[PDB]
Structure formats: structure tokens, C-alpha cells
Design a protein around this ligand. Structure first.
Ligand SMILES: COc1ncc(-c2nc(C(=O)NC(=N)N)c(N)nc2N2CCCCCC2)c(OC)n1
Length: 245
């Protein structure tokens, strides 16, 4: 997250932290995710496509820091890793960039909701907020595009939804953006998602309730003029989500 503010997991208690085990023993951060039911985390396919073996991954819920343990956190294995069959990637765009992780603990359990661990509601079919609507994004991604390190502490920021017409302008993304994507950005381009925020939530208030509107997918740099963040449009994937869960 470029700009924004540091936060803790209580604020975004559906946020899932996904790591990969290396051949050797080391464990590195991969991507964010969102808890949509006790046994299911939703993320982005591009996070996993290079290493599509479920046994390599570890998922944490209730975790506010990258490389230290948060009190009350839970750790899970990946029972199932479901990538979208129609995934494709262009030089920039990732199409159908959505993935489901069924989680279960060493002892065979799913998530137990708590102050630090809660599900996020899915939107109703084809129902998104109006453009200009302020939504929140969360993750452990880079604080500056040039940084080598990821932040230790979880961050969040606010971005505003951009209309499909505005996004498809040539000086923005042209046709790279489809109707199964959403664009969001700051009016000054001063705050954004970035590398390492992939798979995490874009949350908007819908029908009076926090709702998972998007999943962090791609963009051209971070917090650059005329280059919004691009998000998988969750309201266009409900049959896929309902079927695969
Ligand atoms: C100009 O260089 C460049 N381009 C793309 C990325 C990148 N961006 C995002 C992203 O969300 N961008 C955005 N909201 N504008 C994102 N979610 N992921 C990004 N990766 C960079 C590597 C390629 C794609 C996977 C991770 C980047 O990050 C440091 N740097």
C-alpha cells in the first residue's frame, strides 16, 4: 500500500495473509486474501500460477504483522487450491484473476470467528457501488514502488471507484480493462495498491454493509498518474464462487 495508514487486523478482520514454503525451509509472503466463510479464503490466481501446488502454502488469519506472530492468530494448511480455468495474462492485465483456498488446520478445523477473525460479505449479483464511491484496500504490499522490503505492519488506504468508461480511455488502460474488472484510484494518485497487495480485498459499503467488491489484481506501476489500480470485479464471479465452495 502506497500512502494510506498503518492498521491492525481488527479493522480488516477478514484479511488473510498467504505465505509459501521454500524447498529448503524458508517461508516468504505471497499475497493477501479475504475470508468469505470459515473454510474459504478468496484471492488472485496470479499469486499461485507459478507454484500451483497446495502443499507449499500457509494461510494466516488474525495476523497484523508480516514476520511476527499476532496474539489470537490462526494458521492453516491449504486443503484445496482452486484457480480460475479461464485465467490468462497479458503484459499487464490478468484476466479472471480469482482463486479460492479451502483452509484447514493441522488439527482439521476451519476458522473460528473472533475479534480478529471475521468473514466479509459477498456482493449481490452485478451490484457494485457508483463511481466515486470510497472503498478501502488492505495489505502488506510495498510502501513505495522502488522499495525492496515489504512493511512489517499491515496497511490500509482509501481509493475511489472509477467508471468503466474512464478506465478504458487510451491514456489509462484502453481495452486492457474488461467488464469483469474494476478500476480504483486516488484523485491525486497519491495512494494505491502495489506489489504484494495482490489478492487482497477492495471493500465498499453496499446495502449498508461492508462488502467484498474487488480483489487486488494489477496495474502499471503504483500510484502513477493515469494508471489506476485494477481489481477483479467480484460481483461478476458469483456463480463461479458459489459453485466452487
Ligand atoms: C512499473 O512497475 C510495476 N508494475 C506493476 C507492479 C504491481 N502493481 C500492482 C498494483 O496493484 N498496481 C496498482 N495498483 N497500480 C500489483 N498488484 N502487483 C504488481 N506486481 C509487480 C510484478 C508483476 C505483477 C505482480 C506484482 C509494480 O509493483 C512494484 N511495479
Amino acid at each position: 500500500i502506497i500512502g494510506g495508514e498503518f492498521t491492525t487486523i481488527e479493522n480488516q478482520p477478514w484479511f488473510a495473509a498467504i505465505y509459501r514454503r521454500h524447498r529448503g525451509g524458508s517461508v516468504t509472503y505471497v499475497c493477501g486474501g479475504s475470508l468469505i466463510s470459515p473454510c474459504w479464503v478468496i484471492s488472485a490466481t496470479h499469486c499461485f500460477i507459478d507454484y500451483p501446488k497446495k502443499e507449499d502454502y500457509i494461510v494466516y488469519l488474525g495476523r497484523s504483522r508480516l514476520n511476527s506472530n499476532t496474539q489470537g492468530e490462526m494458521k492453516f494448511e491449504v486443503e484445496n487450491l482452486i484457480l480460475h480455468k479461464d485465467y490468462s495474462a497479458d503484459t499487464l492485465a490478468h484476466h479472471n484473476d480469482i482463486a479460492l483456498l479451502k483452509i484447514r488446520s493441522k488439527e482439521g478445523r476451519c476458522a473460528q470467528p473472533s475479534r480478529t477473525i471475521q468473514t466479509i460479505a459477498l456482493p449481490s449479483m452485478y451490484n457494485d457501488p457508483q463511481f466515486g464511491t470510497s472503498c478501502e484496500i488492505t495489505g502488506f504490499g510495498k510502501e513505495q514502488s522502488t522499495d525492496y522490503l515489504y512493511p512489517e505492519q499491515l496497511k490500509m488506504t482509501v481509493v475511489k471507484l472509477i467508471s468503466h468508461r474512464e478506465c478504458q480511455q487510451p491514456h489509462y488502460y484502453g481495452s486492457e480493462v474488461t467488464t469483469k474488472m474494476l478500476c480504483a484510484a486516488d484523485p491525486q494518485w497519491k495512494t494505491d495498491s502495489c506489489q504484494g497487495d495482490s489478492g487482497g480485498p477492495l471493500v465498499c459499503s453496499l446495502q449498508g454493509r461492508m462488502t467484498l467488491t474487488g480483489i487486488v489484481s494489477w496495474g502499471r506501476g503504483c500510484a502513477l498518474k493515469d494508471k489506476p489500480g485494477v481489481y477483479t470485479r467480484v460481483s461478476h464471479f458469483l456463480p463461479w464462487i458459489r459453485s466452487h465452495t
